[PDB]
Scaffold this active site. Structure first.
Site, PDB file in Angstrom:
ATOM      1  CD  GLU A  41     -10.109   3.361   0.630  1.00 58.33           C
ATOM      2  OE1 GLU A  41     -10.136   4.595   0.433  1.00 58.33           O
ATOM      3  OE2 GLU A  41      -9.261   2.617   0.090  1.00 58.33           O
ATOM      4  CB  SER A  92       0.158  -8.003  -0.933  1.00 56.99           C
ATOM      5  OG  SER A  92      -0.746  -8.801  -0.158  1.00 56.99           O
ATOM      6  CE  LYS A 105      -4.103  -2.020   0.242  1.00 57.40           C
ATOM      7  NZ  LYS A 105      -5.117  -1.921  -0.835  1.00 57.40           N
TER       8      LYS A 105
HETATM    9  C1  0JO Z   1      -8.215  -2.901   2.129  1.00 53.64           C
HETATM   10  C2  0JO Z   1      -6.871  -2.845   2.690  1.00 53.64           C
HETATM   11  N1  0JO Z   1      -5.890  -3.808   2.428  1.00 53.64           N
HETATM   12  C3  0JO Z   1      -5.933  -4.592   1.417  1.00 53.64           C
HETATM   13  C4  0JO Z   1      -4.812  -5.498   1.189  1.00 53.64           C
HETATM   14  C5  0JO Z   1      -4.811  -6.377   0.079  1.00 53.64           C
HETATM   15  C6  0JO Z   1      -5.917  -6.383  -0.949  1.00 53.64           C
HETATM   16  O1  0JO Z   1      -6.057  -5.060  -1.563  1.00 53.64           O
HETATM   17  P1  0JO Z   1      -5.616  -4.895  -3.112  1.00 53.64           P
HETATM   18  O2  0JO Z   1      -6.434  -5.864  -3.940  1.00 53.64           O
HETATM   19  O3  0JO Z   1      -5.893  -3.443  -3.422  1.00 53.64           O
HETATM   20  O4  0JO Z   1      -4.135  -5.186  -3.156  1.00 53.64           O
HETATM   21  C7  0JO Z   1      -3.725  -7.199  -0.104  1.00 53.64           C
HETATM   22  N2  0JO Z   1      -2.708  -7.278   0.774  1.00 53.64           N
HETATM   23  C8  0JO Z   1      -2.679  -6.468   1.835  1.00 53.64           C
HETATM   24  C9  0JO Z   1      -1.527  -6.577   2.793  1.00 53.64           C
HETATM   25  C10 0JO Z   1      -3.748  -5.584   2.095  1.00 53.64           C
HETATM   26  O5  0JO Z   1      -3.652  -4.791   3.201  1.00 53.64           O
HETATM   27  C11 0JO Z   1      -6.489  -1.721   3.562  1.00 53.64           C
HETATM   28  O6  0JO Z   1      -5.367  -1.833   4.172  1.00 53.64           O
HETATM   29  O7  0JO Z   1      -7.206  -0.738   3.718  1.00 53.64           O
END
Ligand code: 0JO
Ligand code: F9F
Ligand code: F9F
Ligand code: 0JO
Ligand code: CL
Ligand code: CL
Ligand code: CL
Ligand code: CL
Ligand code: CL
Ligand code: CL
Ligand code: CL
Ligand code: CL
Ligand code: CL
Ligand code: CL
Ligand code: CS
Ligand code: CS
Ligand code: CS
Ligand code: CS
Ligand code: CS
Lengths: 267, 394, 394, 267
Positions: free
Chosen positions: C108, C376, C86
């Site tokens: 958010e 991630s 992120k």
């Molecule tokens: C919705 C969130 N996080 C999503 C997230 C995700 C999934 O979000 P994306 O599909 O945008 O990568 C994947 N891996 C990690 C470590 C994450 O924190 C948030 O931190 O607000």
């Protein structure tokens, strides 16, 4: 150191092993400790090994850790231990007295001054548990200058070089470790020590006392049958103190019965 | 006899029960052999780069030096895998354990960062890891307990004494003295008996080597000083080592002042203790007049220890390095400052180093100076403890 | 009218109240300008390298593929400053906010990782940050709440609806529609109205670019497939983008299966939803027969969202990328596996991607395949939740 | 769309502004909602704006969020809303009826089919809150094919291009937004809208109704004095529903009193 020489000669004449209890000075208090020690001697102890309470005794398991703690709870200090040693020596002119020290207590106010104080009160040997032979020079030199036997450990993992060093540098007795680990009656030695006993004799070492995990008469006999000059028992003795804190009377009776049986096994 | 010098001047040595000397000798030989072994070096390098993520960033502060002539960089060991510099030397020691045919690891931990590093290396490299941790530290550094357990390590609370790092260290050494044939003692700091202060330095020295190359690339010169907190001494010796021969570079070590030196509740034996013998070494100790080892205190579990590694005592004695202290409250202010003005949450240990750097800047704001702080770890382990403290205030 | 195409095939668009169109147009123009601006690019690069710590490691698994013909690498976004991918795009969007003269940030968050990234960037770059987070997520991702608050950000619990990420997203957009003159909406995923899916991809594309260079250096060829979990789509599009034109490389996205697709308690609209219009975009939605948006469910707060970014919907429709699902229990097994056998504690989101990779290996263990999983983020935020779950079992 | 044309002509002849209440269909239930709407009309409403409950109304603040929730708690669906609209139209043949929709409900089963259903029940306009002019093509085309006025928003931040588009594409009325933000009586508009009203007229836009934050008679008067053709009030009306859920009788009396005062202000 000559008190050991005299003891071992007398024992040899009597075809006897030595039985040597350990306790912490001042456990559970000064008065009771003095009575404890009188009882050990009256019951047949051939010599004493006496611990000075230390904050961090890293060669000791829980039983003797707790002994150190009880002495501290009673306010016992090394200075008071020296007072006690004078009183013990005044009562008992011939018994060999060995201290179990940790390095910081010896080093603290000068190594030479420490051994001087040992000589003035009539101590016969000092074992410093966290000083290996490699670091021993200033300790053993100070000991010998003050007629104190420096006690060296012969571990089960000793090589030939170590046996020769211990044999040459040591006086009084050689400490033959039963096993790896820390003090405690719960863990008994595993591996026969005959080979080490024999080599120490070949190299004219001070007579060997086996120690660590010795808690029963049978093990005392076995140490002697294996060729050692005797055995030391600490945790087993201290456990009797621990279990009877609320009855000093019953404490002494059980210590007397145990030491007498342990001594009988050396004969 | 040994292969290497066990002393730094009068400090150091091998003050262990005789039973442990073969284990120490074996470890020293394994180290000397490994240091000449290209395959070992290559495996170590591979883990440091591709597993732990080295080299770490060197970040220039954007905000907290504004209005002064201080330029402050932070060496980002907080970004290493595991979250602290502890990972570097654990990877090297784990490889030594395997080289010696050991199957088990014993470690002490205070902050839990060395415990996590030991657990993760043991999980990767196939060792069965047990970690002693004081019961007070189990509470105040709880997130690290969760991390160690989830990685499969055995965490053994120590209730004895102060129930903090000293007490864990005692239990680890006692265990090792009865298990050394199968277990390697993976000591987490540049202290203890030889050969640990030497090995730990050599397996942390990349911190200072990278820092030197990074500051030369960014500033075209050496730093005026490098600043690190001092528990047992590993992150600071790791940062200092490659600069020792650069006599223009100040080496500043920060001990914990706790509630204040004058209270006796601190962990600063190098400047406020006296030489003594404990935990395998001759080194400065917090001790009573009659030679009992005292209990230390710090807000930071990782600095809460009543001694210090012998090379620091030596570098102090000759005047090559200078040592200072920072109190709990100073460390807390620096923690808040970095979170709010640089967006980095530091370990409370590392916050001591930052606090001193910020004092150096604030006390003499027109002094031109190029400073590096070793940001030894991230503060995730500390956030509950700190939040609680600040809430009880703010 | 717009400068860039707002659609990927039939998906995407700008389905916002008219009031917000000037803000979107302004953001698009700022982005297009910034992308041509060497000074902006240099500032971004500087932050990514020296502040966030890029490039991140690519780690080869040592243990979890043993006895199979799978070679598995993990792209270590868990090592980036903040603990998740992120951070990359937040640094770019924060610079855009400053370029547009905005002083405040709205974000958010679900997992709290985007919230922490937004807070840390705002602390560094001088923005006043407010973060909406569903009240359920405030509990199950509590460590991130502590981190955001300690960095000075305002965390606003959202009790409405499911009290999870969808509900936070609604509140963020509602706030933005009344504050856009002063506040930038720093949307955390590759979803929402144009230009966000485009900007988020372009500010995450270094993940796949580095991966490509790293695998070419280590293996001398492209991977057979790259695998990433899919919430709104940012980490997966970041990994996929640079491989889209390499037609031999599989692109596999993993949606949360929750308690099981058949239960309806999941977050997998791309494969089990129907196109609809919500949160500014035309994209696959979990929705009722009569067009109400459903509530999603996942064990992982970061994947718990009833829609998906439009570029994923497009790449699926043309068959360029393939999407699958992994249940809560599968994700938990992969989390435990990585902790215990590689010494890495992954985010539960990332654990979905790992679980699918381990299925690919286990199902066909004699298939030769070179796989990359986008790790991630790190799992510090998850350790209490997971420990509780496993204790209630083991 | 012709019902608006007829209304505005009648109002113009009477030198009057329009007062147009908003409510959510089915809040707090179907029966009570129908009575509510009858009361709004009897009390002087010139037209209605009627919301179909939606899961995620992102242009609405808490008051109208809660209205949507109450309708859902009563089991209200779009299909039932269409049943309601038929009943309203059957009772009230001339009043203009405008729906407030979100895009998903229009798109769900086909945009064309949605507007067809609107035409069959006798709806006159549709405003889709999350469709800006840029995305409006299929919506406005479907609306006009079914004789439904597509309602466009003229925001306070409108440029000239937007004014021309709204003016050309819109029918029925032009929605003149009071302010940025979401629906709610708590936030009143700040910036005069005279310039926008004038430009819409120049470009022959559908007559302007001001809406958002209108909660008092004075603001209705002010909208008309500024040149708008009338005003819409939602949250203020809905608050009366909210506050009187436990007295349907008192609810209707207060709605009647409020609407009548709001309508009086338009005269
Ligand atoms: C919705 C969130 N996080 C999503 C997230 C995700 C999934 O979000 P994306 O599909 O945008 O990568 C994947 N891996 C990690 C470590 C994450 O924190 C948030 O931190 O607000
Ligand atoms: O019977 P146990 O098991 O309690 O052992 C009794 C030990 N008491 S002692 O003074 O001989 C003694 C001797 C040596 C010690 O450590 C060292 F070997 F490292 F030097 C510790 C205590
Ligand atoms: O009096 P308030 O503040 O409650 O406002 C009343 C609004 N009800 S409405 O149907 O006109 C209405 C009109 C437009 C809306 O959103 C949009 F502008 F984005 F299109 C939402 C509601
Ligand atoms: C004692 C520990 N930690 C110490 C520590 C220290 C102090 O230890 P050294 O002096 O060995 O670096 C500094 N910074 C961090 C992040 C630390 O975790 C431990 O984790 O067990
Ligand atoms: Cl007492
Ligand atoms: Cl001799
Ligand atoms: Cl080397
Ligand atoms: Cl275990
Ligand atoms: Cl060089
Ligand atoms: Cl570019
Ligand atoms: Cl705040
Ligand atoms: Cl290239
Ligand atoms: Cl109800
Ligand atoms: Cl018109
Ligand atoms: Cs790096
Ligand atoms: Cs500066
Ligand atoms: Cs210390
Ligand atoms: Cs393999
Ligand atoms: Cs999703």
């Amino acid at each position: 150191m000559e008190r050991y020489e005299n003891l071992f000669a007398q024992l040899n004449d009597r075809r006897e092993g030595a039985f040597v209890p350990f306790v912490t000075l001042g456990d559970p208090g000064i008065e009771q400790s003095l009575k404890i020690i009188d009882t050990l001697i009256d019951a047949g102890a051939d010599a004493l090994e006496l611990g000075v309470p230390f904050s961090d005794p890293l060669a000791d398991g829980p039983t003797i850790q707790n002994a150190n703690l009880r002495a501290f709870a009673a306010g016992v200090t090394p200075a008071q231990c020296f007072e006690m040693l004078a009183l013990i020596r005044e009562k008992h002119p011939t018994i060999p007295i060995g201290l179990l020290m940790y390095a910081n207590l010896v080093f603290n106010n000068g190594i030479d001054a420490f051994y001087a104080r040992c000589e003035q009160v009539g101590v016969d040997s000092v074992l410093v548990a966290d000083v290996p032979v490699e670091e021993s020079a200033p300790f053993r030199q100070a000991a010998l200058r003050h007629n104190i036997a420096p006690i060296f450990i012969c571990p089960p993992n000793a090589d030939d070089d170590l046996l020769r060093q211990v044999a040459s540098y040591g006086r009084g007795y050689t400490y033959l470790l039963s096993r790896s680990g820390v003090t405690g009656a719960e863990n008994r030695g595993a591996l026969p020590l005959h080979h080490l006993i024999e080599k120490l004799k070949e190299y004219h070492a001070a007579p060997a006392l086996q120690g660590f995990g010795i808690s029963s008469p049978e093990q005392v006999s076995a140490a002697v049958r294996a060729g050692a000059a005797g055995a030391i028992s600490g945790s087993a003795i201290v456990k009797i103190i621990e279990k009877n804190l609320a009855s000093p009377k019953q404490m002494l009776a059980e210590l007397r019965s145990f030491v007498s049986a342990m001594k009988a096994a050396s004969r | 006899t040994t292969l290497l010098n066990p002393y730094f001047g009068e400090f150091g040595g091998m003050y262990v029960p005789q039973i442990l000397m073969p284990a120490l000798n074996q470890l020293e030989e394994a180290f000397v052999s490994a240091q000449k072994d290209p395959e070992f070096q290559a495996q170590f390098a591979d883990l440091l780069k591709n597993y732990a993520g080295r080299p770490t960033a060197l970040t220039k502060c954007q905000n907290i030096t504004a209005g002064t002539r201080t330029t402050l960089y932070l060496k980002r060991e907080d970004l290493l895998h595991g979250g602290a510099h502890k990972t570097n030397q654990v990877l090297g020691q784990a490889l030594l354990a395997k080289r010696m045919g050991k199957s088990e690891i014993i470690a002490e931990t205070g902050a839990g960062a060395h415990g996590v590093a030991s657990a993760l290396a043991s999980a990767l490299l196939g060792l069965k890891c047990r970690i002693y941790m004081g019961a007070k530290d189990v509470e105040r550094q709880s997130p690290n307990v969760f991390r160690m357990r989830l990685m499969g390590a055995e965490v053994i609370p120590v209730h004895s004494g102060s129930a903090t790092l000293k007490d864990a260290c005692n239990e680890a050494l006692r265990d090792w003295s009865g298990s050394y044939e199968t277990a390697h003692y993976m000591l987490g700091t540049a202290a203890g008996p030889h050969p640990y202060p030497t090995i730990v330095r050599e397996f942390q020295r990349m911190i200072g080597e990278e820092t030197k190359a990074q500051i030369l690339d960014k500033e075209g010169r050496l730093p005026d000083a490098v600043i690190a907190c001092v528990g047992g001494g590993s992150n600071a010796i790791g940062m200092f080592a490659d600069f020792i021969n650069d006599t223009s570079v100040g080496l500043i070590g920060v001990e914990p002042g706790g509630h204040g030196i004058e209270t006796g509740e601190h962990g600063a034996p190098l400047k406020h203790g006296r030489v003594g013998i404990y935990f395998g070494m001759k080194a400065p100790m917090m001790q009573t007049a009659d030679g009992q080892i005292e209990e230390s205190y710090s807000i930071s579990a990782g600095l809460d220890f009543p001694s210090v590694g012998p090379q620091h005592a030596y570098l102090n004695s000759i005047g090559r390095a200078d040592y200072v202290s920072i109190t709990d409250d100073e460390a807390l202010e620096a923690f808040k400052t970095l979170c709010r003005h640089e967006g980095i949450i530091p370990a409370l240990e590392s916050s001591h180093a930052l606090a001193h750097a910020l004092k150096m800047m604030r006390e003499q704001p027109e002094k031109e100076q190029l400073l590096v702080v070793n940001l030894s770890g991230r503060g995730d382990k500390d956030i509950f403890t700190v939040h609680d403290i600040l809430k009880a205030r703010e």
